[PDB]
Symmetry: D2
Subunit: 254 residues, 4 copies
């Protein structure tokens, strides 16, 4: 069976991806910061017997471990996370930007850098970055997070050009307003399904007037990873329910 790595599986698009990839018949190797602790890894493995958590934390280490134990990495889902911190540009430190770039650009780069050679040698593989739709509709005072996510989107697009010759599609999925259940990355049930202000905000700024679901994200990840539509390689997908809705002139209804 085909192998798939999902990183930061407890957060963002991790569970939607891992669960739907597993249902599609992949062996899903799952990374997470919490899996440094045996108790957390074992608890996850018991709750999700169809998933295979690994303890390895860093990119080369993780790729090498999965390759040793399962033969090869057929699918990489780089589910990258970093807390958005809103500040006026002069109130950040430079290290605040470096941290965002490290988590949101250097990390997916390092994973591809470690796995690309084995994919190129057999001329097969799929690479998916989960990034952000914030560059499409940016908020004021989120300059660090948003620009790093744009770097990752362009990284995916550029990589598609060189890896296409080796039959390796590369995609970026950029969500916004994706319900993240009990993860703070980025729309947890509380407040986003519980507080009237937040419920009204989502109804206002998305065309579909709701949060996106983990199932929708997982369906897209599994579809791309299936090899059924490789000709989309290089695509940045905006998975944001039609966000942004743009405020209309006075006198028009919402």
């Amino acid at each position: 069976h085909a192998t798939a790595i999902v990183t930061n599986v407890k957060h963002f698009g991790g569970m939607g991806s891992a669960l739907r990839l597993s249902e599609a018949g992949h062996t899903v190797l799952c990374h997470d910061e919490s899996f440094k602790q045996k108790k957390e890894l074992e608890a996850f493995a018991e709750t999700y017997p169809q998933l295979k958590p690994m303890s390895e934390q860093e990119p080369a280490e993780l790729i090498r471990a999965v390759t040793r134990a399962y033969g090869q990495v057929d699918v990489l889902v780089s589910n990258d996370i970093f807390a958005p911190e809103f500040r006026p540009i002069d109130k950040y430190t430079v290290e605040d930007y470096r941290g965002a770039v490290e988590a949101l650009q250097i990390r997916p780069f390092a994973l591809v850098n470690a796995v690309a050679s084995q994919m190129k040698k057999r001329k097969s593989g799929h690479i998916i970055f989960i990034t952000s739709a914030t560059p499409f509709g940016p908020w004021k005072e989120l300059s660090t997070y948003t620009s790093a996510r744009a770097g990752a989107n362009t990284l995916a697009n550029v990589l598609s050009k060189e890896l296409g010759e080796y039959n390796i599609p590369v995609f970026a999925i950029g969500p916004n307003y994706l319900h993240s259940e009990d993860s703070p990355y980025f729309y947890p049930t509380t407040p986003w399904k519980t507080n009237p202000k937040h419920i009204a905000h989502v109804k206002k700024v998305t065309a579909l007037q709701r949060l996106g679901t983990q199932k929708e994200l997982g369906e897209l990840v599994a579809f791309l990873a299936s090899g059924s539509c490789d000709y989309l390689t290089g695509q940045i997908f905006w998975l944001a329910g039609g966000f942004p809705m743009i405020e209309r002139w006075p006198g028009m209804p919402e």
Copy 2:
């Protein structure tokens, strides 16, 4: 079962769409200019017993006929076609542009204009335009066709904003280098799989170094129409295998 209209079914993305939608369990009502002739309609119906060709040619007429005979239109695939004519801007006539706009913008607009009310009333439906990736990577001297296709892409994106409130996703799929078998719209087997110059051109300008397949287009259409990933509403998909490849500096290999 859910109904799906595919227009110009003999051409462009028509057969990939109709066949994969049918496999997914839709009743697929098929439009085509050739179905004005009973012999052509009956021959198609015999060759493809899982498809239902209609004789109706024009938008309101077609929507009304399918609604009368099958109850409702759940999915619209506006597979729009017009021959690309390359000319210096001053060598066209103004009517050359009007013809492109009529075929590539007014036609999908007219179809949505005719079907939107029934979708809005029941708060369900999916709309897919098959357009072109030419606006993403334009060729010189194709100003009429390319700009009309961009109008259609923007039409899809804008429509997603108003129809989202009614739970109707709207998408545009913009192909290039899609193999179109025995249709001249736009990459027929001859010359594109038979002539060495054409084979070499496709290898040069696409990242995956091949034509796209009807199966890949059909997989995307059926995935979007399935209701499995509505949160992509408003997306323009570039289905062009990583086109364009951009020419590199002297001294670098191809």
Copy 3:
């Protein structure tokens, strides 16, 4: 001296363009629908002695008349207008879309189709379309106007590819929230500087928290027409003060 045509001079970007081009030393030939009436044309010529209003209305006749009287057309500013009419997609007629594409796509196409040969023969000229920033940040229920403007933007970008061989730059300037003085196209003094609701809306949705000025538009038109920065050819300029501002999460200041 160098000649420039500015169309619909009384509206949208017309006076900013005409007045700044004249100050930069162009002979500015002005079109306007009101110039069908001799009295209107003569009142304009008396108020603006540095401008030269023409009575011609149709693109071919206008280009021919300017060429006959002033030798050549060095700069074309296609300042296109159409009344934005907001409707749900099913409440338009198809003719409502044809009217929008005729005014916003066919017309700039016809003007370039009529003037390009003379510019190509001498290998000099500049072409500027004034379009819209609505495709960048679309409002719901403006599907006709917005998609036609996107067609015009792509037309300019595609035209740049063929005309660059002849040393003719082509640009599109897409405004939003440009103050238009007494013209209803699209942000007249009343209500946009006089009604508190409109004043508040402009402050909220633009980054600079004000309307754009005719002077700003004219400075950009004159700069591009000057031959000082031809290497921008093909650019779509968003002249919208940093619109759109995107609504932020609850808890964050405006």
Copy 4:
């Protein structure tokens, strides 16, 4: 008088920017890595008496020194450079990507982080990044450089949203094929005007069939810095002569 900082003045868009800003009446404070050597700084000051070279290298020290000596920083031109190194993704090291993001994203971020407070306090200033058009038309095997430049472009666009409230426009100018005279960043006279292969390549891939000039870049920088067209804030300018030209089908002329 108004002050402007131009970084890496000997390279890329540095001299075009500095020389045209000076001609427009700015006091132009010039940074360059070579100005670590007193002899280099003094030779520059003697050749260009209208320019003021500074020895400071680090962003905070440079802004502080200009502010101390000349009162304030009115215009920042962050003319960022890094050597483009083409490699397959697996042949880079991770540090190769960190170097690119440090030079092309962290550095402009640090300069704005150091200068923004003084501009905000007085509600005036202009910020221009010189980036790259490579994200618009990416070459294969340049994943580090190209994705870092896209990060910088998005940084400028996001910054425009918060700084517009303070009347500070932010722009990114993304060049390609800009003639850079004796600088190797990125199109020096030799080989790009002297080697037939390079001459042919520029003719093929740009619409205007030539390199861009330092004067064209400087005209755009001075125009944006002038305060004449602030309503363009947030714009990414592609200063690439209509690049990329996209290869056409067999049978069509070049």
